[PDB]
């Protein structure tokens, strides 16, 4: 499992599949990055999030 900490809060555009996450939230990567985004799982929801705002733990 690739597990990441959110480094900066980000409001996602849900119309295009992005997710809102808060700084310091922990998420699990699902699949590979593309175009600056990656799919992540919060434990309740899945969506796309900017890879620049993730740090692997």
Swiss-Prot record:
It is linked to Congenital myopathy 13: An autosomal recessive disease characterized by congenital weakness and arthrogryposis, cleft palate, ptosis, short stature, kyphoscoliosis, talipes deformities, and susceptibility to malignant hyperthermia provoked by anesthesia. Coiled coil: none annotated. Residues 2-57 form the SH3 domain. Interacts (via SH3 domains) with the calcium channels CACNA1S and CACNA1C. Component of a calcium channel complex with CACNA1S and CACNB1. Component of a calcium channel complex with CACNA1C and CACNB1. This is SH3 and cysteine-rich domain-containing protein 3. The gene is STAC3. Required for normal excitation-contraction coupling in skeletal muscle and for normal muscle contraction in response to membrane depolarization. Required for normal Ca(2+) release from the sarcplasmic reticulum, which ultimately leads to muscle contraction. Probably functions via its effects on muscle calcium channels. Increases CACNA1S channel activity, in addition to its role in enhancing the expression of CACNA1S at the cell membrane. Has a redundant role in promoting the expression of the calcium channel CACNA1S at the cell membrane. It comes from the Eukaryota. It is found in: Cytoplasm; Cell membrane, Sarcolemma; Cell membrane, Sarcolemma, T-tubule.
């Amino acid at each position: 499992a690739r597990v990441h900490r959110v480094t900066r809060s980000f409001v996602g555009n849900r119309e295009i599949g992005q997710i809102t996450l808060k700084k310091d939230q922990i998420v699990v990567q699902k699949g590979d990055e593309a175009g600056g985004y990656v799919k992540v799982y919060t434990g309740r929801k899945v969506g796309l999030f900017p890879t620049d705002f993730l740090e692997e733990i």
